[PDB]
Amino acid sequence: PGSMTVTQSQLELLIRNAFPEAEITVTSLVGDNNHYSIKVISSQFQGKSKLEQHRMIYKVLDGLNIHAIQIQTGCK
C-alpha cells in the first residue's frame, strides 16, 4: 500500500530485469538530507570477495568511477 508509483523505479526495474535472482532493496537513511543507497541482494554476488564485488560494481556502473557509497552489494 501507499506508493503505487514507486520512486527509483528504473533502478529497481533495471536490476530486477538484469538479474532475476537479485533482490533490490532501497537503502534509505532516516532523514531527507543524505542520498539514498541501493542494496543488491543477489546470490550472483555471493561467494565473491569484496574485491570481486567492487569490480563487478565497476562492471555494471562502468559509466562512472565509483569511489563513493551509492551501491551496496551483499557482502558475506
Method in brief: NMR
Compute CA distances 63 → 1, 35, 41, 72, whole Å: 34, 19, 22, 17
Rounded to whole angstroms, the Cα distance separating 11 from 26 reads: 9
CA angle 26, 36, 48 (to 5 degrees): 60
DSSP letters spanning the chain: ---SS-TTHHHHHHHHHH-TTEEEEEE--SSTTSPPEEEEEEGGGTT--HHHHHHHHHHHTTTS---SSSEEE---
Domain ranges of the chain: 6-76
Class of domain 6-76: alpha beta
Set of cell numbers at residue 4: 503505487
Rounded to whole angstroms, the Cα distance separating 60 from 34 reads: 23
Rounded to whole angstroms, the Cα distance separating 16 from 20 reads: 5
Residue 11 in contact with residue 19, Cβ under 8 Å? no
Rounded to whole angstroms, the Cα distance separating 66 from 76 reads: 20
